[PDB]
């Protein structure tokens, strides 16, 4: 039994690891820096990502970012075992990537369904924030009929029990025991940003949006600040679509409502002489 | 076995859970409880165990340093798998107690051992995923307290398809356990908890909030939830400041996975031990300054040194920070101890920036503004419990400032109703409420420092104070010291004040590096202050905790005749409501001066400073034509 | 504190079982309804108001006389021993003090015998204290901040048990009986004692009881009981010991410094162990970060200078390389982070190094300093 | 085995003799004559009559009190047959009560005694006690006396039985709310509230604001992760030393009694003899009288302090709070008409709307100390007018109206 292989993803990861081993190796120095300082997330400049293969590597990574993420995660976390295996230890292999420095800064005014799944950066005034919470990034379960264990049970945007007991000697399904120790969790936070005053013409009204922050990038959002985010747009189920006019599709009955949200992996706020001077040509 | 537990085959949880390892460390623990090397003090733990059975309690406090000194890895396992170590330690303690007092299991189920003196402390803003399931020590303020309700501990189920009873399951307070397969039937049918064979516990949920003076600039107060179990309930009440050591775990599993995007949980702390303290190097350093001749003028000169003049106002700040003696006379009578101060005068006289200094100096300070504060937001608020759906109360600014100070800016400009609720706090030091079925009283022991403006924005020196402000005699009566400020014009006064301020902006302006720059800061403190500011904060704290000067009625004629004299001159003049409450300020402010010297006795000199400050206040707040006459009438004082 | 009442417990068959039970659990007990208590109260008033100490007596190497102290406090002390081999010629000058002393010694000597008979299993020393053979010290504070003291006797007697702390004692009508080090030492583990805290300016008279001081501390040791009391008096009064025992005071004072660095090393082991397990990596933390936590464990202020003393005694204790920030650090030397057997071995290693280095200093003919010099980390 | 428990109970009713009389047999016989199907058993007689059954009842009343109901029913019906329904058990006891804060997870299913004040009551509801059912598939009939209907027929598919309504029996039940005395509650704490349930003859005896003594069973029931709401099955509710009586009688015989007590009121303050004496009159209060038309004269003495600030007027109220056995202290600003007087709120435990008292309801039968009386709103004053001049509070909220007495 052989599963389908994504040849484009394999090509991307091969180009991804080759970029990591050749970029000058400041990023590996950052990798060693993370091992020294016990860090979780590595940060990569987009323009650094966009200066290999004339930037075509970034383009494929950008427009289909949500698809290709695991390949880059494998690409790096193989490198960490190659050069900093201690980061794999615990007291387990939590690892994150957070990009930044995008050229385009799209407005809340300019959200299109075409942008779903692509990498984009936006800017908006914060109005409300949520308290930080742990997010079940990856879970694991132990069987109920027998006592086999299932690891690396990823929860992609929903709660998901394992669909089978791996050993054919057992027939357990839809009945599992959740581990709270071998499992792993990650930080989580919601930010409610608002369209800037200079964007909305007179008479028009400000648009509002909810933005998700996870990892160490949480709590870098404070009310009243002009924050700037970087990430990808992802849709989530909605409950307020009921009662709207027009024919609504159905699943078969099951509902298929959606609403637009933006997920951000990096946080920064727009604002000592020599610090400012060197940033200009 | 022995010393074989140090082998690390896998993560610490993979090694402790092994029964052979468990027996080894359980055997290893049994030696520690019975014998410990405390030299002349013998094995105090045996005495601790023996006295606990005598006292009939479950609180075996265990010092971290003792176990860490004797048993290296046996203690370090408690810092990474505290739940596992505490599970077996209870059993080891249980048998140890029965050696001295057998049949302890007859009345007591378990020994809820308490860890103490744990050396690593984290704030509520430090907890991360890396510290999950560990043992953590935090300090905070009890804001909201829920009731006491039972919770399951060991759970047994009855199968619906057979009469058999399922085995016991420990309730982790993490998830409402729901089994899926019967042991006998192997069926997935219904199950119900067998209440007649289920062991409960006591559960109370308490909220801890950052200390008022520790909130970072420009952020809401971070706060967490704490789980008190096993007779750890009712250890603290609203307004108390506590430090607690517990386990940092996650238990909010439910609709959060769907009601909010993606599966997320929420964090709690399961408290193990809680506590609501000076080395020799501190007290010995205090007494050196204490023996310095004339210490009172050193403290007063150090009250916000970057403000020129206003010495008869800085003394009120100095006296209020130290406070008096909250004399609960014979129990049946009570008198407030803290000194209330009202700052009044023209704009441009630093009536507010001083209140931006009392906040940074007093141990616990809550700051408020006149129009930005509401009556409900100051005294107490009403909430519904998210777990038990009951009416609960949450403390306000005054409740937070218990054993501290409350700072109100622009006291006059607030609406009348918001100003009205303050009346009880300034005399009762308590909040009385009756709302939505809640009938109770809280503790609001806090001095109030208020800044205000006269009617029209300028002080009319030709009119009485009672006519210069929109307030009234009642509100003014609850104050002890009133600091009238005149912005009169004079070249000599202006030259001295301006040359002080122009130098203040020179120094407050920016310009082993830690040590070198910390030297520079205390160097500038020496330029302007006779006392280093860090010590003064501690010195005030030490005085408030240890010093309670007593009284001898030697100067009774001196004070009584002053009281009679002040009353006589206010019989027909628009002035302060000089009453018995105003006399008490003289004695209490005398206590502060005595408590500045760390003396235990109210000397004649202390009243001499006390009478001069109190009498001068009444003289200064008079019309011009009358002020010059009382200037000479009270020259004796 | 247990109370002994002569109205119901005054016979030897009554006192001995009671004293034995008290001393197996406690070190201090009270005497009630003594016939001389009423006279003692009158005698105390005469001493504290009329019979003031002879301030012109001076003070001697025998730690007897009227020693002037700080805050104009005077201490009138006398020592008496039956054995003439010790020259305690400076007998008590005031008869009212002797009146209290005789009354205390009248029943206290029998009680001192009771204390020895209660817990001391040595058959050779059952009657080590008696009328024929006894040694007593008369102590009297005087004023013309509690002081921690530990008498070296078998039993200590106070005519009034008030303002005495160990928790305070508020029983003026009962005499205080406290056991010293010698009874606990000769108890063979059956009884132990603890030091007390008293007001040094309360004008309180006190009495302590030994067998004749020429008796050795134990048959296992060469020094006599007088040597043990001499060491305590040298430690208690450095100004007196400066003229007569300069080197001895330096030797005795240096022992406390050794205990300082030993417990300091123990604290560093605990703190550094927690720091290793709290991180996924072994990078050494900077010293200034650890010091606030170190001082909390020590319950007193600890700075860089005290830490460097550990390096002088044991060079292989830690790795203290200076960080690129220019800040000192410290870390465990062992390549594998820690092992409970190696932790004890390294703790014993410092103990052996310090003890040998202590013996090296005391064996030197030069006069001895009472502190460990600090190590100098190689500057970069 | 359990027949001995029934037999021992039968001896304790038919044959137990006190004061040379069959008190339990006679009082049960008198109840039968009254047709009151209940018996008041005194626990102090039970311990003196048979300690062995007391051990079982005190420790495991799970089966004993079912035996109590069935044994008394058999014995009482035997008496009825001799002279010419299920009899409710009522327990009267004088044993020591456990503090409401002292209830823990150890007294589960144990009979406990409590004392407190009712703060809210519920409306009556009917609960089944005897049922008869019929199978819908085959008309098979049977009788049934928590209880759930059978899943299969005894002769039909799952759950084949339906209830025969005209041949079934039901009993009434009430839900009560109890909390500890606020005087016994230290400041900074809200008194703990406890849910109680009563049925049949024990219902509607107490209104909100009534101080009671409780004998009941401590237990829990599901309604947090596993936080079950505690509740009490009510078994019996009741609502000075000889030397103390002589001591206080001697106090009444003191020649300077009036002046001594007058001085005793706030001795820390000087003079003020007149205001002290009026407050003394406030402590005693007047004597109640009832008009022949049925109206009641208000016996409370209400006094207003209306003087200059700084005259210890606030301290005078505080001292009364510490001397009045029933004392409530509240400020004018931090009070509301709903907070002061009665209110209607829905109990989340039983999902029903309960009538709930307020501060002016808790202080019934005692003294309340209100401060800054001028600072409270007129609506609060208006509600006070009814309490002051009629000792009643009328509630009209949502869609329900009621009147509640308040002797404050
Ligand atoms: N006596 C003084 N010494 C130094 N600075 C002063 C003094 N009085 C006023 N100031 C300055 O004037 C300002 C007064 O601010 P504020 O306290 O708001 O005035 P107000 O008295 O109206 O509250 C402060 O910034 C302070 O620097
Ligand atoms: N006759 C008196 N004897 C003793 N203390 C008094 C007397 N009159 C007033 N006081 C003092 O007044 C204070 C109480 O005043 P209070 O009634 O609270 O003022 P207000 O009327 O503004 O509420 C107490 O601290 C008390 O010591
Ligand atoms: Zn399986
Ligand atoms: Zn089954
Ligand atoms: Zn049928």
List keywords for this structure.
part of a larger assembly, 4 chains, C: about 375 residues, alpha+beta, 8-stranded mixed beta sheet, two-stranded antiparallel ribbon, D: about 400 residues, 12 helices, globular, binds adenosine-5'-diphosphate, binds zinc ion, cell cycle (chain C), DNA replication origin binding (chain C)
Would you report the number of β strands of chain D? 16
Write the H/E string of chain D, N to C. HHEHHHEEEEEEEEEHHHHEHEEHEHEE
Largest interface: B-D, 68 and 58 residues
Query: What general outline of chain D do the C-alpha atoms trace?
Result: globular
User: Treating each run of at least 4 consecutive H or I residues as one helix, how many helices of chain C?
Assistant: 10
Approximate helicity band of chain D: 25-40%
Global geometry of chain C: elongated
Beta-strand residue fraction of chain C: 15-25%
Question: What are the bound molecules?
Answer: adenosine-5'-diphosphate, zinc ion
Main sheet: strands, sense, barrel of chain D: 5 strands, mixed, barrel
Which structural class best describes the helix and strand composition of chain D? alpha+beta
The structural class of chain C is: alpha+beta
Radius of gyration of chain D: 27 Å
Assembly category: part of a larger assembly
Q: From N to C, what is the helix and strand string of chain C?
A: EHEHEEHEEEEEEHEEHHHHHH
Biggest sheet record of chain C: 8 strands, mixed
> Roughly how many Å apart are the termini of chain C?
61 Å
Total number of helices of chain D: 12
Strand content of chain D: 25-35%
PDB class: replication
Keywords: AAA+ ATPase, DNA translocase, ATPase switch
Entry title: OCCM maturation intermediate stalled with an Arginine Finger mutation in Mcm5: Conformer 2
Chain A: DNA replication licensing factor MCM6
Task: Describe the model.
This is part of a larger assembly, with chains A (281 residues), B (637 residues), C (380 residues) and D (408 residues). Chain A is α+β, with helices and mostly antiparallel strands and 281 residues long. In chain A, 23% of the residues lie in helices and 30% in strands. Chain A has six helices and eleven strands. In chain A, strand 5 and strand 6 (149-154) form a beta hairpin. Chain A is globular. Chain C contains ten helices and twelve strands. Chain C has helices at residues 12-25, 37-49, 95-119, 181-186, 225-236, 238-244, 246-277, 287-298, 304-313, 340-363, and strands at 3-5, 28-32, 65-68, 73-81, 135-143, 147-149, 155-158, 161-165, 168-171, 175-179, 196-198, 205-210. Chain C is elongated and about 75 Å long. Chain D is an alpha+beta fold. In chain D, strands 3-7-8-10-9 form a five-stranded mixed beta barrel. In chain D, strands 1-2 form a two-stranded parallel sheet. In chain D, strands 11-14 form a two-stranded parallel ribbon. The interface between B and D is large, with 68 and 58 residues. One zinc ion is lined by residues 143, 145-146, 148, 165, 170, 172 of chain A.
């Amino acid at each position: 039994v052989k599963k389908v292989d994504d040849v484009t993803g394999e090509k991307v990861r091969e180009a991804f690891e080759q970029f990591l081993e050749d970029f000058s190796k400041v990023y590996r120095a950052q990798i060693e820096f993370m091992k020294i300082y016990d860090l979780n997330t590595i940060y990569i400049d987009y323009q650094h990502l966009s200066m290999r293969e004339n930037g075509a590597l970034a383009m494929a990574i950008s427009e289909q970012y949500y698809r290709f993420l695991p390949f880059l995660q494998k690409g790096l976390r193989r490198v960490v075992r190659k050069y900093a295996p201690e980061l794999l230890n615990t007291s387990e292999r939590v690892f994150q990537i957070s990009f930044f420095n995008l050229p385009t800064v799209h407005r809340i005014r300019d959200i299109r369904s075409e942008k779903i799944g692509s990498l984009l950066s936006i800017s908006g005034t914060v109005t409300r924030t949520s308290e930080v919470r742990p997010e079940l990034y990856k879970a694991s379960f132990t069987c109920d009929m027998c006592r086999a264990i299932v690891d690396n049970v990823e929860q992609s945007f929903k709660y998901t029990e394992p669909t089978f007991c791996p050993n054919p000697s057992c027939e357990n399904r839809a009945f599992w025991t959740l581990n709270v120790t071998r499992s792993r969790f990650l930080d989580w936070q919601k930010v409610r940003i608002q369209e800037n005053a200079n964007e909305i013409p007179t008479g028009s009204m400000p648009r509002t949006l909810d933005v998700i922050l996870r990892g160490d990038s949480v709590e870098r959002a404070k009310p009243g600040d002009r924050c700037k985010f970087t990430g990808v747009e992802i849709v989530v189920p909605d409950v307020t679509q009921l009662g709207l006019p027009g024919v609504k599709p159905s699943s078969t009955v099951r509902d298929l409502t959606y609403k637009i949200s933006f997920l951000a992996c990096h946080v920064i706020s727009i604002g000592d002489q020599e610090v400012f001077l060197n940033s200009l040509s | 076995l022995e010393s074989l537990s140090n082998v690390k085959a896998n993560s610490y949880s993979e090694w402790i859970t092994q029964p052979n390892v468990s027996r080894t460390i359980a055997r290893e623990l049994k030696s520690f409880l019975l014998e410990y090397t405390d030299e002349t003090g013998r094995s105090v733990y045996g005495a601790r165990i023996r006295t606990l059975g005598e006292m009939n309690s479950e609180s075996l406090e265990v010092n971290y340093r003792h176990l860490a000194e004797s048993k290296a890895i046996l203690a370090l396992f408690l810092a990474k798998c505290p739940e596992e170590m505490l599970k077996i330690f209870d059993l080891v303690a249980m048998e140890a107690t029965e050696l001295h007092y057998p049949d302890y299991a007859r009345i007591h189920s378990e020994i809820h051992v308490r860890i103490s003196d744990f050396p690593t402390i984290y704030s509520l803003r430090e907890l991360r995923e890396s510290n999950l399931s560990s043992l953590v020590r935090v300090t905070g303020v009890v804001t909201r307290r829920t009731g006491v309700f039972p919770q399951l501990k060991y759970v047994k189920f009855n199968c619906l398809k057979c009469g058999s009873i399922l085995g016991p399951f420990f309730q982790d307070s993490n998830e409402e356990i729901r089994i899926s397969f019967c042991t006998n039937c192997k069926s997935k049918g219904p199950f119900r908890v067998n209440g007649e064979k289920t062991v409960y516990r006591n559960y109370q949920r308490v909220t801890l909030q950052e200390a008022p003076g520790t909130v970072p600039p420009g952020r809401l107060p971070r706060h967490r939830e704490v789980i008190l179990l096993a007779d750890l309930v009712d250890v603290s009440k609203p307004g108390e400041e506590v430090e607690v050591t517990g386990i940092y775990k996650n238990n909010y599993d439910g609709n959060l996975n769907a009601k909010n995007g993606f599966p997320v949980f929420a964090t709690i702390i399961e408290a193990n031990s809680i506590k609501r303290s000076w080395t020799e190097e501190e007290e010995r350093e205090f007494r050196k300054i204490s023996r310095d001749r004339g210490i009172i003028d050193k403290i007063i000169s150090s009250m916000a040194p970057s403000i020129y003049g206003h010495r008869d106002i800085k003394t009120a700040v100095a006296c209020s920070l130290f406070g008096g003696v909250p004399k609960n006379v014979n129990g049946k009578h009570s008198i407030r101890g803290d000194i209330n101060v009202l700052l009044l005068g023209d704009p441009g006289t630093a009536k507010s920036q001083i209140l931006k200094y009392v906040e940074k100096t007093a141990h616990r300070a809550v700051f408020a503004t006149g129009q930005g504060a509401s009556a409900v937001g100051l005294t107490a608020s009403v909430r519904k419990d998210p777990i038990t759906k009951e009416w609960t109360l949450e403390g306000g600014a005054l409740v937070l400032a218990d054993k501290g100070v409350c700072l109100i800016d622009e006291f006059d400009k607030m609406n009348d109703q918001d100003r009205t609720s303050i009346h009880e706090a300034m005399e009762q030091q308590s909040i009385s409420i009756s709302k939505a079925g809640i009938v109770t009283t809280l503790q609001a022991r806090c001095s109030i420092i208020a800044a205000a403006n006269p009617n029209g924005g300028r002080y009319n020196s030709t009119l009485p104070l009672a006519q210069n402000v929109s307030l009234t005699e009642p509100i003014l009566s609850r104050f002890d010291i009133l600091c009238v400020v005149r912005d009169l014009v004079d070249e000599e006064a202006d030259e001295r004040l301006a040359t002080f301020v122009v130098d203040s902006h020179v120094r407050s302006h920016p310009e082993n590096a830690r040590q070198r720059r910390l030297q520079r800061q205390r160097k500038k403190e020496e330029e302007i202050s006779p006392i280093p500011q860090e010590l003064l904060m501690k010195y005030i704290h030490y005085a408030r905790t240890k010093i309670y000067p007593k009284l001898h009625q030697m100067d009774m004629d001196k004070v009584s005749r002053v009281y009679a004299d002040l009353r006589r001159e206010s019989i027909s003049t628009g002035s302060f409501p000089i009453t018995v409450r105003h006399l008490e300020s003289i004695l209490r402010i005398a206590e502060s001066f005595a408590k500045m010297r760390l003396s235990e006795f109210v000397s004649s000199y202390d009243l001499d400073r006390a009478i001069k400050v109190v009498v001068d206040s009444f003289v200064d707040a008079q019309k011009v034509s009358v002020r010059r006459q009382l200037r000479r009438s009270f020259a004796i004082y | 504190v247990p109370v002994i009442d002569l109205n119901r417990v005054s016979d030897e068959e009554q006192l001995l079982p009671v004293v034995r039970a008290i001393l197996l659990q406690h070190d201090t007990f009270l005497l009630k309804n003594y016939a001389n208590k009423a006279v003692l109260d009158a005698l105390l008033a005469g001493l504290t108001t009329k019979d003031l100490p002879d301030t012109s007596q001076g003070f001697d190497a025998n730690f007897t006389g009227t020693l002037p102290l700080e805050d104009d406090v005077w201490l009138e002390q006398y020592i008496f021993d039956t054995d003439p081999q010790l020259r305690f010629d400076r007998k008590c000058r005031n008869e009212s003090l002797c009146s209290i002393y005789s009354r205390l010694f009248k029943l206290g000597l029998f009680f001192a015998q009771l204390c020895v008979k209660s817990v001391v299993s040595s058959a050779e020393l059952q009657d080590c204290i008696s009328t024929s053979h006894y040694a007593t010290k008369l102590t009297r504070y005087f004023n013309d901040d509690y002081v921690t003291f530990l008498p070296t006797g078998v039993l200590t007697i106070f005519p009034c048990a008030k303002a005495i702390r160990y928790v305070s004692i508020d029983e003026p009508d009962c005499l205080l009986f406290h056991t010293g080090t010698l009874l606990a030492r000769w108890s063979q583990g059956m009884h132990t004692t603890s030091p007390l805290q008293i007001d040094p300016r309360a004008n309180i008279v006190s009495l302590t009881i030994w067998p004749p001081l020429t008796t050795p501390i134990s048959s296992k040791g060469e020094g006599t009981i007088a040597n043990h009391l001499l060491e305590q008096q040298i430690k208690a009064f450095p100004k007196v010991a400066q003229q007569y025992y300069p080197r001895e005071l330096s030797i005795l004072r240096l022992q406390d410094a050794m205990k300082f660095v030993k417990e300091l090393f123990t604290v560093c082991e605990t703190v550094l162990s927690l720091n290793a397990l709290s991180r996924s990596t072994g990078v050494p933390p900077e010293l200034h970060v650890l010091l606030p936590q170190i001082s909390s464990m020590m319950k007193r202020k600890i700075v860089q200078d005290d830490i460097l003393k550990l390096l002088t005694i044991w060079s292989d204790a830690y790795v203290v390389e200076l960080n690129s920030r220019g800040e000192l650090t410290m870390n465990l030397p062992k390549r594998d982070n820690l092992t409970t057997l190696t932790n004890k071995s390294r703790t014993l290693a410092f103990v052996e190094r310090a003890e040998s280095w202590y013996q090296q200093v005391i064996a030197s003919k030069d006069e001895i300093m009472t502190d460990v010099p600090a190590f100098k980390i190689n500057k970069r | 085995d359990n027949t001995e428990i029934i037999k021992s109970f039968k001896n304790f009713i038919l044959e137990f003799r006190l004061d040379s009389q069959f008190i339990y047999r006679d009082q049960l016989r008198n109840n039968i004559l009254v047709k009151n199907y209940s018996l008041t058993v005194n626990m102090e007689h039970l311990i003196g009559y048979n300690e062995d059954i007391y051990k079982k009842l005190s420790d495991e009343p799970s089966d004993i009190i079912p035996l109590f109901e069935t044994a008394i029913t058999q014995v009482a019906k035997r008496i009825s047959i001799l002279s010419r329904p299920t009899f409710q058990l009522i327990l009267n006891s004088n044993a020591n009560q456990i503090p409401l804060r002292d209830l823990d997870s150890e007294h589960v299913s144990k009979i406990v005694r409590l004392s407190g004040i009712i703060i809210s009551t519920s409306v009556l509801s009917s609960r089944a006690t005897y049922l008869s059912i019929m199978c819908r598939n085959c008309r098979h009939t049977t009788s049934i006396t928590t209880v759930s209907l059978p899943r299969s027929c005894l002769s039909c598919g799952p759950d084949p039985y339906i209830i025969i309504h005209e041949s079934s029996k039901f009993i009434d039940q009430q839900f009560l709310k109890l909390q500890e005395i606020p005087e016994l509650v230290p400041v900074g704490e809200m008194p703990r509230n406890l849910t109680m349930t009563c049925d049949r003859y024990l219902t509607n005896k107490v209104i909100p604001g009534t101080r009671v003594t409780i004998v009941g069973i401590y237990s829990i029931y599901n309604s947090g992760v596993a936080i079950r709401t505690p509740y009490i099955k009510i078994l019996g509710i009741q609502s000075f030393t000889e030397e103390e009586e002589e001591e206080f009688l001697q106090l009444s015989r003191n020649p300077k009694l009036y002046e001594i007590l007058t001085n005793s009121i706030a001795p820390s303050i000087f003079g003020n003899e007149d205001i002290k004496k009026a407050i003394v009159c406030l402590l005693m209060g007047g004597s109640k009288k009832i008009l022949p038309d049925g109206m009641r004269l208000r016996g409370d003495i209400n006094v207003l302090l209306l003087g200059d600030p700084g005259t210890a007027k606030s301290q005078l109220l505080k001292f009364v709070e510490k001397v009045s056995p029933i004392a409530v202290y509240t400020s004018g600003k931090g009070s509301s008409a709903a907070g002061l007087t009665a209110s209607v709120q829905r109990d989340p435990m039983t999902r029903e709307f309960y009538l709930e008292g307020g501060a002016m309801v808790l202080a019934d039968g005692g003294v309340v100390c209100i401060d800054e009386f001028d600072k409270m709103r007129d609506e609060d004053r208006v509600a006070i007018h009814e309490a002051m001049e009629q000792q009643t509070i009328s509630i009209a909220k949502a869609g329900i109206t009621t009147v509640l007495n308040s002797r404050t």
